[PDB]
């Protein structure tokens, strides 16, 4: 086959040597059958988005892009029945006339619904868990086993595995999610200090249905996003200063004028996020610089506070339109009921880790909170039905095209984790999101990540015995699954 997959980033690629495309169930089920009797790879992907390329096997992929109908809505349940191949902004799109949405979004909506749920993606409020655990059934074609139908009443061990499977137990070809009506939020966007921050927290928390904030690494500027329901009629609050688009991104366009190239026609042109990446370009890891980008981006949002209306769909999403390396670890803070202080205290020691190891650590280190997940394999597995995780992600930008430059940001950022990982991981039970983990290759660091997936995941035999029991010639699995599950 002569389809390359490349992630969002161009950071993994993958060229297939067989890429099936199944049109039907009858069709994929032959597919599954023959690569079992004759031990080929057939591992399952959706949009091969992953920022890792959890789905890439160069021996064989299945893509279930061409089965993406909605099946079944059921109006008194609330619930949508969906093949697995269809993308979350398809299904968004189909629920509209039904007056339904999901209960969460992540970022984007370009995801298929199996790549969405098998990795346990998740958006953001503390009541809210992750889109595993808004899974009420699913079909799994298994090489072992043929179609097997999953729910809590249909097999809940196998089903709580392999809704959160990571592509390892089956190909998932139907799924059943748990929706709420459709609803326009009020989105509030302000500017806090650490310390306004930290006063506010526990009740801003418990009080909002989504709170996101966005860190700005060297300055003491925290961007607060709220979203809220929307009653009837209401409409956005106005901000009192009033700045234009060109009035925000004045402190940006001041800064790029002062680089080796305030404004030309090719700078005029350029969002927010182009700014933010013509900056970067010129000295990524330069430290120094960093600091002085990150305060102009301080700034802008400073200039960007304010009210916005909009369906949960269109608000909830947000930026990540530049391509990057990212980290992202879920890790527990506490109970709705028993508040803890350990999220904040994450953010305290990695803003210090940064200082002190001279990190250009480029803005924003992004918060969220979800509620805790019944899935074993979840990162924010509890088994506290109340449970608050918070989910805190790094980012460097690739702001260029440039290999060397793209190389040295890769390094940057491996030294960057890596610290997180050392310093920070172990003490909060921080847990890696299983689109962004990366394999290490040196095999003491390899053991070592098997040791915290042990002590993070007490699933991990279950997950293997199943893995066993449904996949024994593991033509599911890629070289990933086999160094993090030996
Ligand atoms: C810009 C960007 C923003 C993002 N924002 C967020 C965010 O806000 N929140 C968040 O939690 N995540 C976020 N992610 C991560 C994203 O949700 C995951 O990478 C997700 O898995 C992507 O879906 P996909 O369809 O591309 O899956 P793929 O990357 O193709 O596959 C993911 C996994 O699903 C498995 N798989 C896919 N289809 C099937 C199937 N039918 N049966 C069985 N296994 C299957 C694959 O084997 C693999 O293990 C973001 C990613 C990007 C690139």
């Given at each position: 086959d002569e389809h390359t997959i490349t992630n969002w980033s161009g950071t993994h690629a993958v060229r297939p040597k067989r890429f099936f495309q199944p049109e039907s169930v009858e069709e994929l089920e032959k597919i599954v059958k023959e690569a079992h009797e004759k031990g080929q790879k057939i591992r399952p992907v959706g949009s091969g988005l992953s920022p890792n390329g959890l789905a890439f096997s160069?021996?064989?992929?299945?893509?279930?892009?061409?089965?993406?109908?909605?099946?079944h809505v059921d109006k008194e349940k609330k619930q949508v029945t969906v093949q697995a191949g269809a993308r979350v902004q398809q299904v968004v799109d189909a629920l509209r006339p039904h007056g339904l949405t999901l209960q969460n979004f992540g970022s984007i909506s370009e995801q298929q619904i199996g790549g969405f749920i098998q990795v346990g993606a998740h958006g953001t409020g503390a009541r809210i868990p992750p889109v595993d655990e808004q899974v009420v059934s699913m079909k799994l074609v298994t090489p072992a086993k043929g179609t097997i139908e999953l729910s809590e009443e249909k097999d809940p061990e196998l089903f709580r595995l392999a809704r959160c499977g990571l592509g390892a137990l089956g190909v998932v070809t139907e799924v059943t999610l748990q929706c709420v009506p459709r609803h326009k939020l009020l989105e509030h966007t302000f500017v806090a200090t650490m310390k306004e921050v930290k006063?506010?927290?526990?009740?801003?928390?418990?009080?909002?249905?989504?709170?996101?904030?966005?860190?700005?690494?060297?300055?003491?500027?925290?961007?607060?996003?709220?979203?809220?329901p929307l009653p009837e009629g209401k409409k956005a609050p106005k901000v009192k200063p009033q700045y234009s688009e060109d009035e925000k991104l004045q402190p940006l366009r001041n800064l790029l004028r002062e680089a080796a190239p305030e404004?030309?026609?090719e700078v005029s042109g350029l969002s927010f996020t182009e700014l933010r990446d013509a900056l970067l370009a010129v000295d990524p890891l330069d430290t120094e610089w960093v600091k002085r980008v990150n305060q102009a981006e301080a700034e802008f949002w400073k200039r960007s506070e304010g009210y916005r209306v909009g369906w949960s769909d269109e608000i909830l999403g947000f930026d990540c339109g530049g391509q990057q390396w990212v980290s992202e670890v879920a890790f527990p803070a506490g109970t709705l009921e028993k508040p803890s202080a350990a999220d904040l205290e994450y953010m305290e020691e990695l803003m210090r880790l940064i200082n002190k190891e001279g990190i250009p650590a480029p803005a924003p280190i992004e918060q969220r909170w979800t509620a805790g997940s019944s899935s074993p394999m979840s990162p924010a597995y509890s088994p506290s039905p109340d449970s608050v995780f918070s989910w805190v992600g790094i980012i460097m930008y690739l702001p260029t095209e440039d290999e060397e430059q793209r190389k040295a940001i890769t390094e940057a950022f491996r030294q960057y984790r890596k610290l997180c990982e050392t310093r920070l991981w172990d003490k909060y039970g921080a847990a890696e999101h299983?689109?962004?983990?990366?394999?290490?290759?040196?095999?003491?660091?390899?053991?070592?990540?098997?040791?915290?997936?042990?002590?993070?995941?007490?699933?991990?035999?279950?997950?293997?015995?199943?893995?066993?029991?449904?996949?024994?010639?593991?033509?599911?699995?890629?070289?990933?699954?086999?160094?993090?599950?030996?």
């Open positions: 160069e021996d064989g992929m299945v893509s279930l892009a061409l089965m993406d109908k909605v099946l006063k506010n927290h526990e009740k801003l928390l418990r009080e909002n249905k989504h709170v996101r904030y966005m860190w700005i690494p060297y300055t003491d500027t925290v961007v607060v996003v709220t979203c809220n404004t030309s026609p299983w689109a962004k983990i990366e394999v290490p290759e040196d095999p003491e660091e390899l053991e070592a990540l098997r040791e915290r997936l042990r002590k993070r995941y007490p699933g991990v035999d279950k997950f293997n015995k199943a893995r066993r029991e449904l996949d024994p010639k593991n033509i599911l699995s890629n070289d990933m699954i086999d160094s993090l599950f030996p």
